[PDB]
Swiss-Prot record, chains A, F:
Keyword entries, A-Z: Endonuclease, Hydrolase, Nuclease, Toxin-antitoxin system
Keyword Cell membrane annotated: no
GO biological process terms held by the UniProt record: mRNA catabolic process; rRNA catabolic process
The name this protein goes by in its record: Endoribonuclease MazF4
InterPro entries the record matches: PemK-like (IPR003477), Plasmid_toxin/cell-grow_inhib (IPR011067)
One Pfam family hit: PemK_toxin
EC number: 3.1.-.-
Molecular function as annotated in GO: DNA binding; enzyme inhibitor activity; RNA endonuclease activity
Stated family: Belongs to the PemK/MazF family.
Swiss-Prot record, chains B, D:
Cysteine disulfide links: none
Name of the encoding gene: mazE4
Region (Disordered): 59-81
Protein name: Probable antitoxin MazE4
Subunit structure comment from the entry: Forms a complex with cognate toxin MazF4.
Organism in which the protein naturally occurs: Mycobacterium tuberculosis (strain ATCC 25618 / H37Rv)
UniProtKB/Swiss-Prot annotation, chains C, E:
Subunit: Forms a complex with cognate antitoxin MazE4. Interacts with DNA topoisomerase I.
Record-given protein name: Endoribonuclease MazF4
Protein's gene: mazF4
Keywords recorded for this protein, A-Z: Endonuclease, Hydrolase, Nuclease, Toxin-antitoxin system
Annotated control of activity: RNA cleavage is inhibited by the C-terminal domain of DNA topoisomerase I.
SUPFAM superfamilies (UniProt xref): Cell growth inhibitor/plasmid maintenance toxic component
One GO BP: rRNA catabolic process
EC number: 3.1.-.-
Source domain of life: Bacteria
Lineage: Bacteria, Bacillati, Actinomycetota, Actinomycetes, Mycobacteriales
Organism (species): Mycobacterium tuberculosis (strain ATCC 25618 / H37Rv)
Family note: Belongs to the PemK/MazF family.
Functional summary from the UniProt entry: Toxic component of a type II toxin-antitoxin (TA) system. Acts as an endoribonuclease (mRNA interferase) on single-strand mRNA, cleaving between the first and second bases in the sequence UCGCU. Overexpression in M.smegmatis but not E.coli inhibits growth, this effect is neutralized by coexpression with cognate toxin MazE4.
């Protein structure tokens, strides 16, 4: 069921936080867990972070240095889906975090 | 768009052209792009230093977040074992 | 520690036996942060190590983890740029990134 | 001397100019020189590989040469002690 | 071994006790060759570390030696770019190199 | 008495070879030893090697990756002094060998 772009709340052991799925959709259908990046209210100026926009699920930022694996069963409240413009910026941030080469 | 080059710089542009670029234009384009990318990596470096100066557990918000993350990683290594 | 680099394989014991891990996080992160991101070489669509790579095994780019720099054991070598180019392709497929 | 830049490249020339270069000219000059330097370090890297492939004891002509050099070094450390 | 880099200091015992050495050979040499060129930090012409540098002590650029990579000990850290610029200056003076 | 640019024959333990002095002259006067680079007949294309010319003391190449410390007493047979043109190329090669920064 879960899709790339969707934000879910999840508690990893320090309170329930918003998480953006970045795993591809085939993985998400067949596997028991997904890969996600932390949404946060903290504000840091680093190219691995992206600011949400007005038609995004919430206020704050995506930190792509903080990738986590979350069980489907652990997925809490569905907070919406990011805009494709915001998802494009996130792609960049992710590629940067995982040192994908230039161009 | 009208670029001016000293003697050794022109002589270097030719060295890099002879090394396998298509033309002078292509080489300068690429040198500009490589320089930009090099400055981008230099700023990513500095940004990680600043984030770590302000928070030594980055990218985790606290040392507790790290612990949790590592315990869950361990649990996953146990289950595959 | 001499800061580890993307493409290096290190042997790491996480409580269940020493095993080889391949570093995939960028090198700025690798040099300043206490932690690296890696994928492990185990033993389909996954990525085979090649004959010129420093060890035998297979990489599931779906299973990315974070290893503390304090947990890295023995340095086992760098992987070849050709295999790394396949790892990049699999990381971007795994995480839905564009890699034209 | 006439140079042609697509828009992302020209936008990048401006990023690096605004970063502390004096003009567009000075930046391109520096990107050319830095590109050359970068290619010179790749070639030096390739030359050491070659020399080592051919002679695994480079820069010594034989393993015996290395031994002599080590023994003389050790003698000098002994003497400082 | 993860290839050592110009500017790094390593502890090395050459049979007369462990001492710190600063690598001055270029990084290509350091990648492919079995050996590094270094100067040691001991305790006029010389270069002082360095309150932000990883240890205390003094560099004599007149006494350059070659250490095998298999003789390198513990990684003691990396010297500051400010002190390195003084080491470059002293190496060039020691060896009659034109340095602007 | 030994000066930078001069080439002397010396046996380091594997036969008598030519060695070019590269230590500065102040060091050479006041110290018991000098720093020198190996002259050789072997031929290699690497930036750390320099070829001799017609008014150079002998035929062959300077290898600046092979720096060595030689006692004044060990120095022997004076073979001559290299040309300033050649000393400048060796300067470059040495600087390259000891990773002196760009430019």
């Amino acid at each position: 069921a879960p899709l790339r772009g969707q934000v879910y709340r999840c508690d990893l052991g320090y309170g329930a936080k918003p998480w953006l799925i970045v795993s591809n959709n085939a993985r998400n259908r067949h596997t028991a867990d997904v890969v996600a990046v932390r949404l946060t209210t903290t504000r840091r100026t680093i190219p691995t972070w992206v600011a949400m926009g007005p038609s995004d699920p919430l206020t704050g930022y995506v930190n792509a240095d903080n990738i986590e694996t979350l069980g489907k069963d652990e997925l809490g409240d569905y907070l919406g889906e990011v805009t494709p413009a915001t998802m494009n910026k996130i792609n960049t941030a992710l590629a940067t975090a995982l040192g994908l080469p230039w161009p | 768009m009208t670029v001016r080059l000293d003697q050794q710089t022109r002589q270097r542009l030719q060295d890099i052209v002879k090394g396998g670029y298509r033309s002078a234009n292509a080489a300068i384009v690429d040198a500009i792009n490589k320089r930009w990318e090099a400055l981008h990596d230099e700023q990513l470096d500095a940004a990680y230093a600043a984030a770590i100066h302000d928070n030594p557990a980055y990218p985790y918000e606290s040392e507790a977040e790290r612990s949790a993350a590592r315990a869950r990683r361990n649990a996953r290594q146990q289950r595959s074992a």
